[PDB]
Paper text:
Norovirus (NoV) is a non-enveloped, positive-stranded RNA virus belonging to the Caliciviridae family. The VP1 protein consists of a shell (S) and protruding (P) domain.
Therefore, the VLP of MNoV-S7 was used for the high resolution cryo-EM analysis, and the 3D model was determined at 3.5 Å resolution. For modeling VP1’s A and B monomers, 513 amino acids from Gln19 to Gly531 and 516 amino acids from Ala16 to Gly531 were used, respectively. For modeling VP1’s C monomers, 502 amino acids from Val30 to Gly531 were used. The cryo-EM map of the MNoV-S7 VLP in DMEM revealed several hydrophobic and polar interactions between the neighboring A/B and C/C dimers at the P2 level (yellow in Fig 4). A new feature found in the structure of MNoV is that the N-terminal arm (NTA) in the A monomer extends to the adjacent A monomer, forming a complex of the fivefold axis. On the other hand, the NTA in the B monomer extends to the adjacent C monomer, forming a complex of the threefold axis, though the NTA in C monomer is more disordered. As a candidate, we found a potential interaction via a metal ion between two carboxylates (Glu223 and Asp231) observed in the folded, flexible hinge of the resting conformation.
Author numbering:
A (entry chain C), B (entry chain C): 30 to 531
C (entry chain B): 16 to 271
D (entry chain B): 16 to 136
The structure:
Amino acid sequence: VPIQPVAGAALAAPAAGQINQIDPWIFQNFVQCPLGEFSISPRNTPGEILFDLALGPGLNPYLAHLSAMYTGWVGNMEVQLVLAGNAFTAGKVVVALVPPYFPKGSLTTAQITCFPHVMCDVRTLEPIQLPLLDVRRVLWHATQDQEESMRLVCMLYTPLRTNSPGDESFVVSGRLLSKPAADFNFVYLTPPIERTIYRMVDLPVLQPRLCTHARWPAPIYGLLVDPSLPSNPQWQNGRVHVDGTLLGTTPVSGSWVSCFAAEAAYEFQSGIGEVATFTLIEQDGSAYVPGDRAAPLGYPDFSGQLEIEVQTETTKKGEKLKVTTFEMILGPTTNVDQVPYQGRVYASLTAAASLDLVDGRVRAVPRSVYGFQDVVPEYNDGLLVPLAPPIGPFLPGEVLLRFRTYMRQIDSTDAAAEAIDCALPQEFVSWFASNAFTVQSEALLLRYRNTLTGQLLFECKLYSEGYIALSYSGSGPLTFPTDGFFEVVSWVPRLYQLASVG
Amino acid sequence: VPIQPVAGAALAAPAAGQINQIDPWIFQNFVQCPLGEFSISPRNTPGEILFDLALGPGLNPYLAHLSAMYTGWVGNMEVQLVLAGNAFTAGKVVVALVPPYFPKGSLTTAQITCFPHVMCDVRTLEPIQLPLLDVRRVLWHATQDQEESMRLVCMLYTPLRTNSPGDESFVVSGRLLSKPAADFNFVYLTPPIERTIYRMVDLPVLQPRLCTHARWPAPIYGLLVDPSLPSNPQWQNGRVHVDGTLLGTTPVSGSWVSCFAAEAAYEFQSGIGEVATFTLIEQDGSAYVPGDRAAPLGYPDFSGQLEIEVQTETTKKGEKLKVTTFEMILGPTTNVDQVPYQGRVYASLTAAASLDLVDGRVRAVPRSVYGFQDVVPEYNDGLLVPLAPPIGPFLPGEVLLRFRTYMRQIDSTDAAAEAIDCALPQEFVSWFASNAFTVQSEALLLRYRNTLTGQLLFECKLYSEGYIALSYSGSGPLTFPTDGFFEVVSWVPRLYQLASVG
Amino acid sequence: ASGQDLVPTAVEQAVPIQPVAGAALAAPAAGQINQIDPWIFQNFVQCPLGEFSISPRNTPGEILFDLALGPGLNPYLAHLSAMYTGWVGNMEVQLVLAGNAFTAGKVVVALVPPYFPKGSLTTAQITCFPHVMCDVRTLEPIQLPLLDVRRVLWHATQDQEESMRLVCMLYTPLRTNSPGDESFVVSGRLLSKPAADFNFVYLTPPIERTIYRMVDLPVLQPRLCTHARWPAPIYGLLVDPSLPSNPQWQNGRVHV
Amino acid sequence: ASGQDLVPTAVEQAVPIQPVAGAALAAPAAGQINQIDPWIFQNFVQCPLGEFSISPRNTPGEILFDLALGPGLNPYLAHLSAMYTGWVGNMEVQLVLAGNAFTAGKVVVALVPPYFPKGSL
């Protein structure tokens, strides 16, 4: 590889304050990078990204762990590329060594082998040693800011042409193994850092039956998946990123969901009467400016006829405490002008005599629906509205698992006619929006691990748009016991093949 | 100091696998221990614990941070004792060096100066160097198990006799500053450890207005403190430890609180009628065995007349969906046999014609009370019951701050007659019971820090029985704006003097 | 050993940081030669910041000053930095702590690095940073370095520094031993000089709108002024605690 | 010379008594060999007696403490003396006097001999 460096730590050692050794035992293990696990299948046309792995302390667990107490780092990493292919499987693969500040728009096959690359092979026997020496623009990189460093871009080249057996296509699975060289050493030691850009997402050890639902205030009763239900829903509560940035109407509260706070108005009673006008604000004493939330925070996002309690400061025949039914059409039937996007909802009062009600600041908890459908409510007059996007593209063998609760409703036709679905419940939404992790990949592997037996129930990938997918080939419903704590393994890439669910 | 050691790392270096250096810059800073900050006031009779600081990597932030990637450690620490006292303040103080496996039952003044101690003085000018060399019983200590190591016990001796000015008693504030010696080095490097016994409690960056209340399903509206209210309440929801061990009826859910799941029975209608019997179980499909929880998880813990919704599978005149009032006396008035401890509650049905109801598994969300009192409900017939203990002893200048919500109720006498109080809301209960920290002290300092200005609103200590205290000298109510994220500083001891609140 | 002393006359605690080699790095970068003066050096001169009065009514987790390294630590270098762009930094900073032999208390300095968050600097963050703790009673001026640990060749003199800071925290708060009702609020004026290595890199014209210039108030009289709330001359400046001293009046107020 | 001092840092006034040669006398008497410990030595340790608080409300003919020489001057020797019969005595006793530079006053020690009446001192 033509690079020819001379120095990478003695350059920054003057203007560093203090440069710090690590220990001579971390410079001797090849411990694998978090997201460089590739698999060359023979049904892959050549010229695709196998991995794009930067420089940095986020290539070992040890450097990422120790780099939370320093202010930065210099020095050169080293890579052992290993491939799980014996003979009779020809086909090259190139590890190009792309510099910092090279744009990522396109990288075809005539572009890989134009860097100082190494053209290795699937048939190789010994592992492949390769330096990743940081071409700086500055003296030392900082460790709390992601920075344009040297990246290692691997791509197959004269692709894999091998003989495959029955029902098992021979993938050549390759791994990267990073190790800092003798040039790698951190700079000035700053001890207090609690939250870091190299921390791993953790997904706490709360049980999925002990956690609050993120779409309706009920404990989660089921944890199932349906290929017969639509695999691409457009939910607006329980949407989150792993970054912590919320999406849509989602509150960081289990008590705010499917509820709203407003200023009431009780006006009309002239023979048919019985209506109320709620001017929406916010559920923690704030205002309402219509931006991108499509509704105030925690507004009920489903089509039905929701009955809502209320706090009334009624003058005559009772104290300042009586609740009532308050039917409220959330559904597509626009009889009254239902618009939570301007923040004006209308609610029929009660089958009552005439009227005795007083306006004020109210907060309207829900209690029952009449007919549930999993479509979005009309937020503005039937017109469009800035929504959270639908749940993104899956691998075609995967469907999203969902977390069943059960509303209480009025049906008079059949019992338990509906159930409420979400992904990443409110104890994970309030987890992600409070820790605010820094993501590496777009997907994130999990293992569902029950407590008192340790049996791996399923593995599942948690996409960074905040939904958990699961590869179930089938067309029937199936459930899972709700006593397993979710636990991470690694930031797996987008097109990852998690095994199966039987 | 008479100890006379010879070696403390070369003993364990044979049976270690690999011993690991740290770097030569961590062995040069005196960075202070987490819980050794003492203050000798002149109104302190001699013979009291100033600090009892063990050995271990939990004496620096750097050793506690780096010790999460090793399997253990050996070696000797070193202590710089500094005191903030100039001349004219005589009075000695002894740092005794107590061995491992010495019982902590009593340590009088004739017991301190009977170890290999150092008898230093308040009037000293240079700081006080002192070794803390680990008297092992084993080869290397492990780093994931707390272990009986050498402890440094400081105690005053011929006490402080100084001249004090007006309204400021001259405390001699002393600090300990730990640093590992050249003998300190870790052993075999095990990289993956996420949760550690040396991790610091963190208290996430959720706003107190965006968090769900832990006693009633409503968003927190106020954050106030009252010296006129009783400073020692006995709450049963929202009780937690920093350890993660829950106390009483507290669920790890915002939706389970003040609610219960049961098997219903609808029997009696004979002229006055209108009663239902709920046999309690659990709110996530479990049983109920009466142990120490005093009620099922999330049972409403307050005295009143709670009206609760229900899901009814009614045969005639409607579908399997209609909700109703269900008055239920939680209060001290034992008309019907109210007992959630055996799991049998009774609820008057409805001012209804006669009866049409069908038994089944129900879950009874609350909607309104008639008269709120902050006393515990009768859990078993008026008899006693294994309860969570009342909120523990404060420093006499401190009262617990509390988190206001507002129920909706029936009063017909006055509006907003009551408000609901808790400490550590459900987004901190579900935080502590999911991280499950390891505690060092009994108290834990916080700083209330508003977001868009950074103004320190108050400092407050979070006791390890799970309640936040606040030193407000006064007799009037005062509130705080609910937009400040709580942030920790250190594990302060029990008898700590946080400043004031004006 | 000048005065008669029941106080610590000497602090030299050997702050553990490698000496940075500034101004031999940015000499090939800039296309100029720029000495400053050999008499702006060897002259300790008070910074236009950081005059800190420690009081007994201060918690020990409280910050006295937080000086970012820059030319805004002398009148001289803040005067020259109106011309130039860029500088390469070293300083010798002397704290002048005062207060009688009847005071007490410590205070930690901390050379906190540039890329550290400007949020919580608690009491327990003294072992992490290269620090020197200092008694309040001390008689000599406390000299200590203030060097830069930077990733660039020079820091641009407008809002582009992100450089190394001195954080002082009172580590043990000021209890006095005097048997009187006397205010022992220890007033300290620290003062900095550039080292033998501070220089400016490139020479731009002075614009007078510069950051950290010497603020000044108009020298007229206070009775020669128009009242900013009613059109009348000021008939008297005064104080009165009996009036409500958190007023909500709108006109007459301006951020400086 | 540790702290800053307006106080007498040193007292060494050369108490005039011949050094007694104990424990080479009672070694032929007892029929045993009995060392104690070489680490009970070189460790100054508080006696279970004599903690004296001088006050301004004290006449100058008043006694602060009267320690008889014995093994009841350490926790160690009073613990070992539950086993043994007999001892041969020497001690180094350190008084720890305190009080600021604003105090005054003297205090005399006195090695009063054994066969002296326990009345008027």
